[PDB]
Ligand binder design. Structure first.
Ligand SMILES: NC(=O)c1ccc[n+]([C@@H]2O[C@H](COP(=O)([O-])OP(=O)(O)OC[C@H]3O[C@@H](n4cnc5c(N)ncnc54)[C@H](OP(=O)(O)O)[C@@H]3O)[C@@H](O)[C@H]2O)c1
Ligand SMILES: Cc1ccccc1CC(=O)Nc1cc(C)c(S(=O)(=O)NCC(=O)O)c(C)c1
Length: 316
């Protein structure tokens, strides 16, 4: 199938990208270099991951070696919650561009709809442990994001972890200049997101599925949580196609017209995860995979369930 998807800004976004959350600074440079060598042209980053400087080193080296041209790459980053205030958005984007060593981003996303109190702490908590919110609203933050497009800093803007009512809020914003091009959300067989995906696609918004493998290395992974990589039913489907369960889990969202960003710092897995364009899951396989949904969430942002903009109280 097509290796890239058309965005509403006219640009094409590679449907397969490399995730970098939890990728150690001392290993992420080699991971990104190997990914580019193998064919990856889309890298998903974020200032909150604390490794954007090292990711930038890999990108610059490959541009310098002439393995790829800048226009061939699709680099994505995200605005953290403590910079939702209108006057802090540009500076947050500039820090990311400085670390990645690029003069523009192909896509910049609002990481979460929730704004936090500005400061050096990524998760500011009060004397009682709750996250301290900021009195900023999604609409004002969006206007600040639109300004980055007009200034040439980013080619497209989008959102992440927004529920359908929050997406609707932006689409109905008075004076809306640029519609969100992408909504990056958690999606895998245990959290299929049928309703939200249908809603977004019907509005011309491309959906990127994160944690496609169930984020086995998530820090809060409890010793006996569900495990997609070891689900016997998924292993059976992979065996039938002579592919690994990870390849099946990556091919799954692709056939739903979604962009997918598996994360890996292991050279052999980075290469294996890219060999997903040579096989096809049947309609029966897809429907079966969709039946495994349990509404199980890897990223629930539990510390902000009290925030006025917490996205997961709504059904979708
Ligand atoms: N917008 C948001 O709020 C948000 C939230 C969560 C995630 N994300 C993004 O989505 C990306 C992916 O999600 P994620 O990091 O949560 O997890 P993931 O991609 O679902 O899983 C990553 C884990 O799977 C392993 N792995 C990779 N390929 C494998 C293979 N072929 N076989 C067996 N194991 C394999 C990795 O190990 P090794 O690395 O050791 O190989 C790592 O432990 C992120 O890195 C980030 O860019 C964004
Ligand atoms: C428990 C624990 C132990 C060691 C190191 C970190 C943590 C907690 C942790 O990982 N926090 C956290 C960090 C980030 C950076 C995000 S996030 O919002 O950035 N989502 C992940 C992503 O975007 O890939 C979230 C939700 C929680």
């Amino acid at each position: 199938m097509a290796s890239r998807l058309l965005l509403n800004n006219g640009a094409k976004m590679p449907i397969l990208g490399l995730g970098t959350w939890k990728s150690p600074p001392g290993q992420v440079t080699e991971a990104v270099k190997v990914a580019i060598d193998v064919g990856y042209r889309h890298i998903d980053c974020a200032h909150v991951y604390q490794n954007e400087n090292e990711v930038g080193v890999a990108i610059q080296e490959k541009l310098r070696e002439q393995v790829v041209k800048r226009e061939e790459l699709f680099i994505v980053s995200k605005l953290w919650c403590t910079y939702h205030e209108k006057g802090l958005v540009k500076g947050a984007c500039q820090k990311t561009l400085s670390d990645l060593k690029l003069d523009y981003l192909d896509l910049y996303l609002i990481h979460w709809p929730t704004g936090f109190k500005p400061g050096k702490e990524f998760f500011p908590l009060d004397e009682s442990g709750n996250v301290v919110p900021s009195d900023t609203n999604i609409l004002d933050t969006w206007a600040a994001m639109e300004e980055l497009v007009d200034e040439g800093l980013v080619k497209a803007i989008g959102i992440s972890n927004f529920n359908h009512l929050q997406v609707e809020m932006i689409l109905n914003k008075p004076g809306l200049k640029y519609k969100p091009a992408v909504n990056q959300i958690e999606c895998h067989p245990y959290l299929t997101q049928e309703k939200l995906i249908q809603y977004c696609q019907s509005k011309g918004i491309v959906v990127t599925a994160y944690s496609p493998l169930g984020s086995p290395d998530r820090p809060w992974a409890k010793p006996e949580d569900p495990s997609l990589l070891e689900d016997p039913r998924i292993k059976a489907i992979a065996a039938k196609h002579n592919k690994t369960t990870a390849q099946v889990l990556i091919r799954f969202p692709m056939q739903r017209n979604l962009v997918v960003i598996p994360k890996s710092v292991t050279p052999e897995r980075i290469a294996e995860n890219f060999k997903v364009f040579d096989f096809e899951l049947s309609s029966q396989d897809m429907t079966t995979l969709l039946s495994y949904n349990r509404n199980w969430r890897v990223c629930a942002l539990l510390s902000c369930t009290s925030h006025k903009d917490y996205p997961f109280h709504e059904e979708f």
